[PDB]
Amino acid sequence: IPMAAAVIEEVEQRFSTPTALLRGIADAMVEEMERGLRADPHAPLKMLISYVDNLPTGDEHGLFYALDLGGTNFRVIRVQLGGREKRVVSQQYEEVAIPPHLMVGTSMELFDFIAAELESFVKTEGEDFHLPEGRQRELGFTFSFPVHQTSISSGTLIKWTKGFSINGTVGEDVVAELSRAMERQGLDMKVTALVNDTVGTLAGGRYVDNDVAAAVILGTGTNAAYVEHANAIPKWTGLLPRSGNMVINMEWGNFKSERLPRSDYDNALDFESLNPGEQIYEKMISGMYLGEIVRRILLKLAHDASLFGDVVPTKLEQRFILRTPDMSAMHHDTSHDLKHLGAKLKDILGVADTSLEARYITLHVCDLVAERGARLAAAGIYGILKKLGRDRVPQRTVIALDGGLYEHYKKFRTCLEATLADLLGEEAASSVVVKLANDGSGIGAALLAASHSQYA
Ligand SMILES: Nc1ncnc2c1ncn2[C@@H]1O[C@H](COP(=O)(O)OP(=O)(O)NP(=O)(O)O)[C@@H](O)[C@H]1O
Numbered sequence: 089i090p091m092a093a094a095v096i097e098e099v100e101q102r103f104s105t106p107t108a109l110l111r112g113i114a115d116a117m118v119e120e121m122e123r124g125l126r127a128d129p130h131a132p133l134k135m136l137i138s139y140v141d142n143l144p145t146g147d148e149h150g151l152f153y154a155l156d157l158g159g160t161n162f163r164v165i166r167v168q169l170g171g172r173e174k175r176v177v178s179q180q181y182e183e184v185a186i187p188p189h190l191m192v193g194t195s196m197e198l199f200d201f202i203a204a205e206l207e208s209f210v211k212t213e214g215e216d217f218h219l220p221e222g223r224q225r226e227l228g229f230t231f232s233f234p235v236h237q238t239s240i241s242s243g244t245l246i247k248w249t250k251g252f253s254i255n256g257t258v259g260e261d262v263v264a265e266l267s268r269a270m271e272r273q274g275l276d277m278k279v280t281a282l283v284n285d286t287v288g289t290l291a292g293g294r295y296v297d298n299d300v301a302a303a304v305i306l307g308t309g310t311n312a313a314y315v316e317h318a319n320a321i322p323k324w325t326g327l328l329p330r331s332g333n334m335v336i337n338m339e340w341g342n343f344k345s346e347r348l349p350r351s352d353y354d355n356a357l358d359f360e361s362l363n364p365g366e367q368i369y370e371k372m373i374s375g376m377y378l379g380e381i382v383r384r385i386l387l388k389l390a391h392d393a394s395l396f397g398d399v400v401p402t403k404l405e406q407r408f409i410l411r412t413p414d415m416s417a418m419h420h421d422t423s424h425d426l427k428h429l430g431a432k433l434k435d436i437l438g439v440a441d442t443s444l445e446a447r448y449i450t451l452h453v454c455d456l457v458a459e460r461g462a463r464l465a466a467a468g469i470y471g472i473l474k475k476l477g478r479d480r481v482p483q484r485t486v487i488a489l490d491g492g493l494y495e496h497y498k499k500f501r502t503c504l505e506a507t508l509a510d511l512l513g514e515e516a517a518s519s520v521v522v523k524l525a526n527d528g529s530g531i532g533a534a535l536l537a538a539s540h541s542q543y544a
């Protein structure tokens with residue numbers, strides 16, 4: 089009991105997110121949104137111009153391929169599109185898990201593995217897909233890392249995030265990197281668009297619902313994109329676009345702010361991370377990191393309060409051994425003896441048996457960790473709504489979501505929705521909609537490759 093409670097009291101203190109604070113944080117997010125838009129050097133929110141001035145209409149048609157590369161897997165995709173009525177006539181896809189090594193080897197090894205799937209996936213092309221003879225297959229590239237765009241279809245990698253760390257490629261143009269690798273496979277294809285996963289998901293959403301203003305990811309990582317007025321971007325240099333509109337990638341993963349309620353655990357996780365100092369907000373909320381925070385809190389407990397016996401289990405000292413899908417397993421156990429939770433602990437801590445009070449303390453720790461992440465992510469979405477002036481009534485505003493964290497972690501999902509609504513107040517909340525646009529970055533990129541064909 090009592091040694092355990094001192095450290096839980098300390099977690100509760102440190103992780104606290106009283107709504108008042110959440111609004112504080114939302115505000116800060118907007119300030120930072122503004123600094124990023126002013127080219128303000130070393131703004132933590134980059135607010136990257138996508139070169140996307142037109143989101144999908146509906147009216148798109150043709151064959152288009154997409155390649156979506158993520159934190160933990162990539163997808164190859166095709167769609168046959170038949171205009172405003174028929175729309176999305178046919179679509180296939182393959183998803184492959186990225187091998188750990190390819191996160192941390194060479195650029196070449198990576199895009200080769202990607203391209204090789206793409207190539208073998210194209211072969212299997214049925215005949216409910218077709219493209220005028222003479223013609224070249226075109227391809228939308230979803231790239232789930234922060235790029236500095238140079239055109240719709242070109243851009244240089246700023247920095248790797250969330251478990252990637254490949255030395256060659258920072259500062260290089262990623263589409264050229266893909267292209268070389270594709271052609272090394274004897275694969276005639278063009279990249280006609282290059283987008284972040286948040287942008288893709290915004291395009292996919294808008295294609296089925298015209299009131300989509302924004303898209304958040306909550307998966308291995310977290311990030312958000314929204315449609316911004318081009319005349320509200322000081323660092324814009326050039327001709328304004330016809331639409332009056334530019335989609336921004338906030339890269340809010342990199343938000344930091346004294347207002348963020350952080351712990352030793354968060355400090356230590358960062359210290360031993362692939363990208364120390366970076367993506368500090370993300371590391372409080374996204375899926376690559378939640379299980380690891382839980383582990384570290386449990387490790388303090390096993391040490392300072394014998395929580396799991398007189399010796400701490402070896403396995404509990406392994407970094408990353410407790411993943412976030414395991415965490416949501418434990419979290420959603422409603423049994424009286426917490427059976428299922430216990431089965432997971434046995435498995436992960438490599439222990440034989442568990443106190444039932446120990447099982448209730450684990451569940452509590454899971455609760456605090458997911459709760460902070462979800463409440464903080466809600467503050468971010470509220471931040472966006474503020475930027476769009478849809479935080480108030482005088483209007484239907486849809487926010488597209490994607491990512492396994494959000495799709496599969498039920499309590500994380502509903503904590504985020506309850507809190508968003510709390511922040512918006514009643515009146516304003518009836519205006520906004522959070523909708524699953526799962527695997528939406530993939531299609532969103534094909535759609536945008538359409539608008540930018542070399543053909544009509
Ligand atoms: N059942 C689950 N409970 C909680 N989290 C989950 C669950 N399933 C998956 N996740 C998280 O979400 C991720 C699953 O893949 P996905 O959401 O497609 O992200 P990704 O494309 O690999 N990387 P990113 O593009 O940054 O989201 C994993 O990294 C997990 O951390």
Ligand SMILES: OC[C@H]1O[C@@H](O)[C@H](O)[C@@H](O)[C@@H]1O
Nearest residue numbers: 232233234249305309310311
């Ligand atoms: O996948 C969700 C997000 O993860 C973040 O950590 C990446 O830096 C973003 O580029 C991406 O949108």
Ligand SMILES: [Mg+2]
Nearest residue numbers: 156158285529
């Ligand atoms: Mg994705």
